Amino acid sequence: MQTKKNEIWVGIFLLAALLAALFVCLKAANVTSIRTEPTYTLYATFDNIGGLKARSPVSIG
């Protein structure tokens, strides 16, 4: 022993830091990837939308 046991002990410590590194970059980079929304649309009627374009957000309150 002691010629390969220290390599796996530092080996499993680096994968413990590698999987913890992916948990830091998980809330900001993984956006609109796993959190989906149901798809049902509505219809409106206006005379002029002004400077409104596609992908414009709606809001209530």
Partner: peptide, 12 residues
Amino acid sequence: LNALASLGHKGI
């Protein structure tokens, strides 16, 4: 054990 053998040479 085989996959972690090459990582020990690049970790020390």
